[PDB]
Amino acid sequence: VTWRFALEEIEGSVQHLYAQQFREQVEALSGGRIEVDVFPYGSLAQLTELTRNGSVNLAFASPGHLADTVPETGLFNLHFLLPEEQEPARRLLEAPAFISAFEPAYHNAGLQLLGFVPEGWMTWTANNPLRTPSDFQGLRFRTMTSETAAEAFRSYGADPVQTPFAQVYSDLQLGNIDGQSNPVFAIEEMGFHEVQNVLTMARASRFIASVVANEDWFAGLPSQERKWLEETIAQLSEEAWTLQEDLNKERLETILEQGGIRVVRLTEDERAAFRDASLPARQRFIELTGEKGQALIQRATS
Template sequence: MSKFSTLKKAALAAAMGLALAGQAVADEWKFALEEISGSVQDAYAQKFKQLVEEKSGGDITVTVYPYGALGESEDLTELVANGVLQFTHGSTGILGSTAPSMQVFSMPYLLSQNNKVNQELLTESPTIYGPMADKLKTRNLRLLSMYPEGEMVWTTNKVVRKPADFNNVKMRVMASPMLVETYKSFGAVPTPLPYSEVYGALQLKMIDGQENPIFAIEEMKFYEVTDVLTWSGHQQFTVAVLSSESWYQGLPAEQRKIIDETVDELAPYIFDTQAKYNQERLEKIQKAKPGIQVVHLTEEEQAAFRKASEPLRDKLVELAGPEAGTALESLEAEIAKLEQKY
């Protein structure tokens, strides 16, 4: 909240007053994003808005707030927990401070290369919607759904094909202990920075690279200040859709049904949409900067990073506790079973 302007503070204070007075359960639902308009999160929220308004016959309106309108990611989850906002997206690295087992999604090479497997896992997993979701409820956060926004891509100023190539490379990461440890294991120098500061830090050579799905690299123009795009296969950026638990439970049954049905319908939609967005944005980058180098690590090259990251299993338990280690084993078992299915 300290980053907000005086005007925003006043507006949010007024909203807080309404929420505490029990008037936030009105016909307007507020959905705040970690990303800008035109992003994958925006696509999700806009489709959510359309479906909710249709299903309610216009009795409910959904207002979508893009990145920066109401604060950084940490601010948004706090506003939802306090009942000021009704919905937001939450990065798993940030949610790990409340639900330590969420840190498993920072583990390299956890998710499947088959998104049919990932879709079922992220929308139906008994591990995710059992122990993980229960932990978030202790902070008054309701986990509605999860989905990947696309494969994480490195943008750097030199080609990185093996861990040794990361020597002395300052890579921006979110403020997540597991992400910091991941890039240490890869051989890089992890540098936590807010999302809004990444472009300037790249431009001023304060950092040498960063990771994000390709759609984010395009919309935030990170490709303008780096020369190489690398698909390493190490991770997909996974995000949670959150609501206020107490607000949700206080809704009439028909409104809870609208939310649940909408979230279920959005799962296949957003998986298809993120794939389309990332392909379109790659084409835009290549058109805007024809000389940018595109690198896809081979299976052998990926194996070197897999091996380098093996100690992270113990580091996960050290940083996030035994429940995170149990969650990792459970998710790996679920993924293996789903890969046989598909």
């Protein structure tokens, strides 16, 4: 029996590593009664439709791919919101009360939410350091494709664009775009470090991907397999924090081998200044999600 697991990312990514672990674990628990076919990006239309349609059972879904159906995921693109420290942040994402707050929004899009997975700190690149909001003024800056994510950088005085990834390398190179944001492994993979001079680490937000399932397939499962599914996802939460820290560190060393790229970690004072200036994205987020958005912000604040 076969479970089909689609990824938004290619081989080598955090999603792929996670999925490999999910495969090995589920096959060993199930005694071969369940086999898992992993479909990385390229090997195949939209993953969220395939999951709703039942064409695949399981998929990763990031806030960008969900923003028009599940706007609450915008929470994950808000700067300085989720706890910085890894353990509180892990606790939150794992909290049944936090997951459950999202479940209805996902159901509303015909999806079963199973959990959240970290892909790493978002990292900024440009051809100058980004130490104060003032450094963003007038900059065309490429953001996640979420209204909330756009507003975050608009708050610093940037002009946010959502240029298609395949075009970003050459637009960066030509100066059509001044910088972008992504986790370090994605930057290395796309080669943006070749056409940028400064990597700024503000630790403002993390890449958080959703694991979702077909709504009826999930519900039409033996309480045993649903435990194999749910307990494994639960286990892999902790290992995911470790996989991404390591993959991102490796990719950062690879980036530095290229040369011509400077690394800047913002001081607490500099971060505090961006926090102050980030607040308006929270307002736009609330306008878009109402009372549910408010409570999510409340749960993640304390």
